[PDB]
């Protein structure tokens, strides 16, 4: 139960491409601090909830999909995040008959938004640069 301390190589790998950063627990954790600094923190919370919906306990899928919608996407939602019209339409139409992939269109849209609007800036930020400088080569 040791604290996960990323090696230099691992942290450098987060700069290889967006999927390496987001698919790494410590990478997401670091990216999350930066997203909150840039006021778009809920984007990653939503992405993770959708990942769980997809590959998680499948007996509560129908229930979880609606919960996620009400928590992140509905008007006035507590953890509201914006998605475009075409995406919302597909999501709402899909929710009339919930299934494992009902939120995939929304999750992908948010994924591409983070990749397009935040990934590069993150790598150029003090948070990443500090993470890299502090990580050491064993």
Which domain CATH number covers 22? 1.10.196.10
53 Cβ contact list (under 8 Å, min separation 6): 61, 64, 65, 68, 100, 102, 103
Question: How many domains does the structure of the chain reveal?
Answer: 2
- Do 27 and 75 lie in a common domain? no
In a domain, 137, yes or no: no
Question: Could you give the CA distance from residue 28 to residue 31 in angstroms, rounded to a whole number?
Answer: 5
Compute the radius of gyration of the chain from its Cα atoms: 16
Domain containing 12: what range? 6-38+118-132
Instruction: Indicate the resolution in Å.
Output: 1.9
- Do 44 and 95 lie in a common domain? yes
CA distances from 5 to 9, 26, 52 (A): 12, 8, 25
Question: Could you give the CA distance from residue 114 to residue 83 in angstroms, rounded to a whole number?
Answer: 12
- Do 58 and 13 lie in a common domain? no
Nearest CA-CA partner of 46 in 18, 78, 81, 16: 81
How many whole angstroms from its chain centre is CA 135?
23
């Amino acid at each position: 139960k040791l604290v996960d301390i990323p090696t230099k190589m691992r942290v450098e790998r987060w700069a290889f491409n967006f999927s390496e950063l987001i698919r790494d627990p410590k990478g997401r954790q670091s990216f999350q601090h930066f997203l909150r600094k840039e006021f778009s923190g809920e984007n990653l919370g939503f992405w993770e909830a959708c990942e769980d919906l997809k590959y998680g306990d499948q007996s509560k899928v129908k229930e979880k999909a609606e919960e996620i919608y009400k928590l992140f996407l509905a008007p006035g939602a507590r953890r509201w995040i914006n998605i475009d019209g075409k995406t919302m339409d597909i999501t709402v139409k899909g929710l009339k008959h919930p299934h494992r992939y009902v939120l995939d269109a929304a999750q992908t849209h948010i994924y591409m938004l983070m990749k397009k609007d935040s990934y590069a800036r993150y790598l150029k930020s003090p948070i990443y640069k500090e993470m890299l400088a502090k990580a050491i080569e064993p």
